[PDB]
Amino acid sequence: LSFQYPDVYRDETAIQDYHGHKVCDPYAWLEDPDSEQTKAFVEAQNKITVPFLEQCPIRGLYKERMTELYDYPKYSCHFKKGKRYFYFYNTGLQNQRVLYVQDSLEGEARVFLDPNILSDDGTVALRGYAFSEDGEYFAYGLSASGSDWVTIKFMKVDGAKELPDVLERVKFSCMAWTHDGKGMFYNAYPQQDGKSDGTETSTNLHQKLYYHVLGTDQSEDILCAEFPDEPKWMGGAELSDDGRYVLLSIREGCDPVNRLWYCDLQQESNGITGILKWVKLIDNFEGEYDYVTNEGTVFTFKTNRHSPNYRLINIDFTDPEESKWKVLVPEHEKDVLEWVACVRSNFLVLCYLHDVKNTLQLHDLATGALLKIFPLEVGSVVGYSGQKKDTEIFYQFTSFLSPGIIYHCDLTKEELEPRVFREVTVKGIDASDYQTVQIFYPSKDGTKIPMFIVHKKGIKLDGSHPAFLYGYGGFNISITPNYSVSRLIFVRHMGGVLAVANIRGGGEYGETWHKGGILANKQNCFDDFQCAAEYLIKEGYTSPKRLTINGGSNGGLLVATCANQRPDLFGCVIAQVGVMDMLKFHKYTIGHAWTTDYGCSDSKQHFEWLIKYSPLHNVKLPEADDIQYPSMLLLTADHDDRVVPLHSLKFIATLQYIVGRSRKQNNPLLIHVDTKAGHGAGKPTAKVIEEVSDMFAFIARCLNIDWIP
Numbered sequence: 063l064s065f066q067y068p069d070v071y072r073d074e075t076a077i078q079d080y081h082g083h084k085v086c087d088p089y090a091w092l093e094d095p096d097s098e099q100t101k102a103f104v105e106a107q108n109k110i111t112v113p114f115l116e117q118c119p120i121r122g123l124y125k126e127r128m129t130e131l132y133d134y135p136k137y138s139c140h141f142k143k144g145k146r147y148f149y150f151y152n153t154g155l156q157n158q159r160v161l162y163v164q165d166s167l168e169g170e171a172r173v174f175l176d177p178n179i180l181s182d183d184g185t186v187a188l189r190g191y192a193f194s195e196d197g198e199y200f201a202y203g204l205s206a207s208g209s210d211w212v213t214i215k216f217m218k219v220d221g222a223k224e225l226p227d228v229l230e231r232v233k234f235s236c237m238a239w240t241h242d243g244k245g246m247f248y249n250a251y252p253q254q255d256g257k258s259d260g261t262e263t264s265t266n267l268h269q270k271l272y273y274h275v276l277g278t279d280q281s282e283d284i285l286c287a288e289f290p291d292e293p294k295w296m297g298g299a300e301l302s303d304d305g306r307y308v309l310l311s312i313r314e315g316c317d318p319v320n321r322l323w324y325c326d327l328q329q330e331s332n333g334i335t336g337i338l339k340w341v342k343l344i345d346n347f348e349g350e351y352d353y354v355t356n357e358g359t360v361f362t363f364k365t366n367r368h369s370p371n372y373r374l375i376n377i378d379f380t381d382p383e384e385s386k387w388k389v390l391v392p393e394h395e396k397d398v399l400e401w402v403a404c405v406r407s408n409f410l411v412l413c414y415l416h417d418v419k420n421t422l423q424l425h426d427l428a429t430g431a432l433l434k435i436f437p438l439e440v441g442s443v444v445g446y447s448g449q450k451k452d453t454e455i456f457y458q459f460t461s462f463l464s465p466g467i468i469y470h471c472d473l474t475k476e477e478l479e480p481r482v483f484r485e486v487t488v489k490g491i492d493a494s495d496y497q498t499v500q501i502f503y504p505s506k507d508g509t510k511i512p513m514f515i516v517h518k519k520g521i522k523l524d525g526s527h528p529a530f531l532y533g534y535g536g537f538n539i540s541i542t543p544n545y546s547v548s549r550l551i552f553v554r555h556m557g558g559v560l561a562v563a564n565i566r567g568g569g570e571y572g573e574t575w576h577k578g579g580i581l582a583n584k585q586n587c588f589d590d591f592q593c594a595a596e597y598l599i600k601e602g603y604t605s606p607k608r609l610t611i612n613g614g615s616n617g618g619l620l621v622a623t624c625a626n627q628r629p630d631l632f633g634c635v636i637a638q639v640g641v642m643d644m645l646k647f648h649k650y651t652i653g654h655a656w657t658t659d660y661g662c663s664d665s666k667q668h669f670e671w672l673i674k675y676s677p678l679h680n681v682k683l684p685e686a687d688d689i690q691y692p693s694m695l696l697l698t699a700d701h702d703d704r705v706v707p708l709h710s711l712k713f714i715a716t717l718q719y720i721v722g723r724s725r726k727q728n729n730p731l732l733i734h735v736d737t738k739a740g741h742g743a744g745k746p747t748a749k750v751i752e753e754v755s756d757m758f759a760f761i762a763r764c765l766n767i768d769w770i771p
């Protein structure tokens with residue numbers, strides 16, 4: 063290390079008692095983001111990382127090459143609202159993609175909403191939008207500097223006229239227009255004392271559901287639902303297809319379960335004037351209920367009640383008893399039913415997950431019968447468009463070496479032959495030169511975990527190639543095939559191997575796959591992931607010295623632990639906006655919501671699981687002498703209100719102090735706190751290119767790999 067680590071004050075009086083257990087958190091002052099102490103800390107760390115990163119001549123190689131390979135047309139699915147068609151498009155290197163509008167699939171598209179002119183650095187992103195039933199009015203949310211907070215503004219679709227309406231203090235909101243098109247449903251939070259730009263760590267409780275009449279001030283919005291008894295509950299709302307019913311999904315935590323109330327708008331004496339006459343249909347968190355469509359009083363939902371892999375059921379609001387429910391499409395024994403859409407009045411589009419791959423089939427609404435099976439190569443379905451009134455669908459398909467293909471299908475045709483609408487090609491990369499392979503490796507307990515492997519055709523397995531292993535594991539999130547130029551460059555001009563392990567904790571094999579990697583079995587996640595590395599090492603794909611593991615958010619927690627538990631298995635480690643303090647993660651912003659996957663330190667029983675793997679409280683110098691901690695780069699941003707950066711700070715301070723101080727430790731323990739960025743969504747192209755070029759530079763310079771022109 064040509065640089066020396068900063069002097070961080072250790073508050074040895076900061077001791078807490080956790081059910082008889084006393085834990086010392088000396089860097090607990092970093093929890094205050096506005097302090098002079100913290101500010102001087104972040105700066106101090108950035109003072110030694112930037113150079114380190116910018117000193118390696120491979121960064122500019124990467125950065126420049128990324129800019130070229132990443133310079134390709136990126137479109138989204140076409141979707142029709144009212145009588146117009148819409149689609150997001152990005153000429154290539156635009157910071158934020160733009161929303162286009164055309165009065166006809168053959169008409170001439172025209173800019174509708176360019177968020178690019180709202181910020182010189184593209185740090186103002188669109189976060190959620192909702193057209194009106196007539197497609198004549200449009201409301202969208204904007205986020206500044208990757209912050210979760212949102213401001214909802216409105217626009218008149220014809221002439222793109224901007225309206226005065228504006229809604230503030232919005233977060234994790236729904237946007238449901240009533241069909242009389244007079245107002246929209248949305249959620250807001252109470253006025254809390256202090257900042258509210260995404261730099262605060264304050265808790266978010268008491269979310270309410272309001273109603274905004276178009277043309278009025280938010281001071282007048284109507285309060286339609288609140289659970290003053292249950293601070294952590296979050297009620298989201300949507301309107302049934304026929305627009306006669308307001309369906310309310312009440313949630314608590316990030317579990318695939320929700321309560322479902324409802325309100326017959328025709329039973330409201332004077333429209334919407336306040337708390338609605340809710341009918342508690344499902345008053346429990348036993349299962350999830352995802353509204354698909356409804357014919358009269360028979361509502362069809364995607365549920366996982368007694369169906370770990372999900373299924374379709376029908377409820378008649380007039381015959382509510384669970385007993386009377388009917389099963390439309392039985393749960394599958396192996397395939398997970400991801401999402402469902404109703405198009406052309408009586409067609410249902412079921413999107414299944416088959417061994418981590420996506421399959422699309424058309425079923426009959428009335429019977430559930432399978433009608434057509436849309437042919438798909440290996441990869442995922444990243445976009446879809448088709449509502450109950452539409453007579454055609456669109457779906458974008460992506461893969462590891464496929465930038466994306468947008469298909470189109472006219473449902474008003476005897477022969478349901480789907481055609482290719484748009485096919486984006488990325489010149490400079492020859493898909494025919496790389497090969498994808500899906501293997502199932504056994505974990506510590508004998509469970510088989512799937513893994514995707516992408517490498518050059520013909521590489522000899524001598525354990526000489528750099529390897530990039532990615533995993534998340536948790537919150538029912540499925541890690542499916544996706545395009546990543548930045549990753550392919552790794553394989554191209556760095557000769558490495560890419561690997562994605564669909565370890566437990568995810569929803570690849572239904573909830574039973576989620577529950578086998580959460581709460582008391584969270585260790586399973588780590589073991590699954592560790593075994594993944596062992597596999598690449600054994601099969602000679604790579605080596606502990608040249609293997610890099612990556613992970614963001616709950617995924618960063620994964621790699622952080624995997625280093626604390628087996629630092630001899632990895633050579634490099636890059637944790638992105640990760641959760642490190644498993645003891646008090648629930649005290650900040652939206653962290654309480656995750657207790658359903660990790661547990662809560664406030665509970666004696668939960669503490670025993672958490673204290674065993676909590677990254678912050680488990681850093682330890684290897685006992686061996688020929689073993690040290692893998693070079694690690696932590697990445698976070700000051701506006702990340704999702705996983706407050708206090709997690710990365712207190713963790714870098716500890717890594718540098720406990721380990722960084724030893725003499726046997728040569729590998730750098732660094733951290734990078736980006737400005738004007740948040741958890742990740744809405745990150746402008748510019749910053750994305752800066753970021754990736756930083757990770758692979760770190761990896762290059764850290765493992766000493768050469769560039770391959």
Ligand SMILES: O=C([C@@H]1CCCN1C(=O)CCn1c(=O)c(-c2ccccc2)nc2ccccc21)N1CCCC1
Pocket residue numbers: 190233234235236296313314315316537615616641652655656704705
């Ligand atoms: O980021 C996370 C976790 C896991 C998945 C998303 N997540 C979050 O907690 C996502 C936050 N979140 C939302 O954003 C919305 C929402 C719905 C509609 C529109 C806008 C928002 N609804 C939620 C309902 C319950 C709990 C959390 C919710 N983590 C980081 C660390 C591990 C958990």
